[PDB]
């Protein structure tokens, strides 16, 4: 009985009940992702990602600018896999690989593929792409 995205945003005070109902009513007609509807209707994208991070047990990263990606960690995923799964392995801490995700929905698929202890972070789209390109030059 974990909270869903809308319930989490409501509890955090970042959307109103009327805004949530409005987004759910549209989703019932369109099938769009709820967070995408809420951001279109005015929720800050960062508010969405903070809530998605909490929902999935990920640490939200406010910036990727200070990360120096460990080349040893990046070898654990082929570049094509890092891009498709939206996952950048950036280093190691106490025998866990640190991995920055672009989409919380991919956490399980990435964790299965890595098949080793890992610590997962979530970064905003622009921040993630900057990090990916530094870790995986083409
Ligand atoms: N990268 C990304 N991920 C997103 C986004 N929006 C939602 N998600 C994530 O994708 C899953 C599916 O969202 P959905 O298709 O809108 O399907 C959702 C939505 O239809 C719906 N629902 C979500 N929140 C609420 C709520 O507060 N009240 C009610 N009655 N239904 C909700 O339950 C379904 C499952 O919700 P969740 O457990 O929270 O699981 C969510 C959530 O983990 C987005 O914009 N970007």
UniProtKB/TrEMBL annotation:
It comes from the Bacteria. 3',3'-c-di-GMP binds at residues 5-7, 34-36, 55, 103. Belongs to the GSP E family. This is ATP-binding motif-containing protein pilF. The lineage of its organism: Bacteria, Thermotogati, Deinococcota, Deinococci, Thermales.
